[PDB]
Amino acid sequence: KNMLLGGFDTGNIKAKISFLNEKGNIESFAIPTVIAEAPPAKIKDEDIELLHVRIISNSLDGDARSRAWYVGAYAKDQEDRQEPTVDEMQKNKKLHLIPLFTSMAVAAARIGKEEVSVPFSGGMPIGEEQILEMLYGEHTVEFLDGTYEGKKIKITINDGTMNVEGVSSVLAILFDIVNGEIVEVGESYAINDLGAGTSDNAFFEDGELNKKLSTNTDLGTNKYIDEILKNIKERFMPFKTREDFIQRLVMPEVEKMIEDDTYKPTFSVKWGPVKENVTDIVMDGMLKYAEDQKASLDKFWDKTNADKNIVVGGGVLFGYAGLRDLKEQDGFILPKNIQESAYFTSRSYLIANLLEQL
Numbered sequence: 001k002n003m004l005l006g007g008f009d010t011g012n013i014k015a016k017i018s019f020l021n022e023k024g025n026i027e028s029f030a031i032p033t034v035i036a037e038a039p040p041a042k043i044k045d046e047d048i049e050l051l052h053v054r055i056i057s058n059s060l061d062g063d064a065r066s067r068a069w070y071v072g073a074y075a076k077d078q079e080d081r082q083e084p085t086v087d088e089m090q091k092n093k094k095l096h097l098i099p100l101f102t103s104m105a106v107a108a109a110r111i112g113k114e115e116v117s118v119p120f121s122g123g124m125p126i127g128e129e130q131i132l133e134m135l136y137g138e139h140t141v142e143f144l145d146g147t148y149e150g151k152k153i154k155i156t157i158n159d160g161t162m163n164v165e166g167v168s169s170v171l172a173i174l175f176d177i178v179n180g181e182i183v184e185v186g187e188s189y190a191i192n193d194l195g196a197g198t199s200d201n202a203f204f205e206d207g208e209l210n211k212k213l214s215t216n217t218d219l220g221t222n223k224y225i226d227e228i229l230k231n232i233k234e235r236f237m238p239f240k241t242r243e244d245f246i247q248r249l250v251m252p253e254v255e256k257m258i259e260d261d262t263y264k265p266t267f268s269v270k271w272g273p274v275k276e277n278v279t280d281i282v283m284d285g286m287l288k289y290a291e292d293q294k295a296s297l298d299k300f301w302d303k304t305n306a307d308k309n310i311v312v313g314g315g316v317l318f319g320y321a322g323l324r325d326l327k328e329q330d331g332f333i334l335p336k337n338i339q340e341s342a343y344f345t346s347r348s349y350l351i352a353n354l355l356e357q358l
């Protein structure tokens with residue numbers, strides 16, 4: 001007892017976490033990979049809307065040693081916010097450690113523990129031992145504002161794993177944890193995690209990650225979303241972030257499609273004294289993404305000649321209108337519980353971790 005069990009999926013867009021709550025079920029949320037220096041004191045995923053935390057950890061250095069930060073959403077608005085630098089083609093570790101520890105704390109607060117040991121179960125994209133040791137030790141997160149203002153969580157990380165080999169990265173395709181731990185309603189396979197800014201094409205052969213053909217591209221949903229937004233704003237002549245566009249406009253419709261294959265989606269936008277039907281605009285970007293992904297998956301299938309191709313990630317949902325065709329194709333596997341496709345990897349890392357504890 002007094003332990004937090006989770007799977008951790010980090011990137012340049014979000015830090016994703018899937019953990020076990022008090023009633024033994026999987027709970028998931030994502031903290032945007034954004035931070036900003038904050039004053040020593042105050043001025044459905046409610047608790048991460050406003051994150052102002054003091055973080056004391058030895059994995060942090062210099063001025064970041066034990067000061068305060070705006071983390072995630074509440075950081076994206078700040079002037080001097082920090083985000084992953086990326087050129088026209090570490091010592092930025094706080095940019096990844098801080099949203100990481102912050103997620104561990106939020107989950108800890110959610111389940112009413114104030115001291116938690118967190119066996120680390122995560123992943124790296126194309127050493128393992130060295131990266132883990134920027135995580136070991138004791139980390140304290142105090143909330144200075146928001147839902148858990150005044151709370152102080154002690155995170156202890158003694159043991160970890162990056163789930164490099166074997167079926168660990170995949171486990172969420174076959175299993176689910178409902179008070180633990182139950183089956184969902186080949187020997188050569190690809191895993192395609194379809195994300196916001198990137199697309200991860202990994203290939204597993206004979207129990208081992210094929211560390212030469214396992215690639216990684218920037219085929220993300222974001223560029224397609226930006227296109228759609230540009231075409232909507234022009235239709236008028238609305239949304240604050242992309243996640244706002246996805247959550248408010250896209251998610252409710254993608255969902256009725258899931259539970260009814262006959263349902264036609266409608267996308268309308270209210271901006272000012274005008275309301276427009278932009279169903280045609282949205283669906284265009286969706287199928288464009290779908291076909292571009294269909295093409296990308298095809299050639300990676302041919303390049304690896306995998307026996308089966310698993311497609312996961314939120315891109316399965318954003319491009320669902322087109323990507324649901326992969327259900328009818330032998331050689332492709334979509335998650336049965338497809339509404340959890342976005343957190344497939346973190347959910348997989350969580351399942352790998354629960355097994356590690358046994």
Ligand SMILES: Nc1ncnc2c1ncn2[C@@H]1O[C@H](COP(=O)(O)OP(=O)(O)NP(=O)(O)O)[C@@H](O)[C@H]1O
Pocket residue numbers: 010011012013014016193194195196197198199220221222225242243246250251254313314315316317318319342343
């Ligand atoms: N239910 C949904 N319906 C439609 N789009 C969704 C849904 N869930 C997630 N998305 C979108 O799918 C895209 C991919 O999400 P996700 O895989 O979680 O990105 P990410 O992993 O955080 N970024 P990356 O590091 O590149 O993988 C994003 O644009 C999400 O907003």
Ligand SMILES: [Mg+2]
Pocket residue numbers: 009011193195313345
């Ligand atoms: Mg991802």
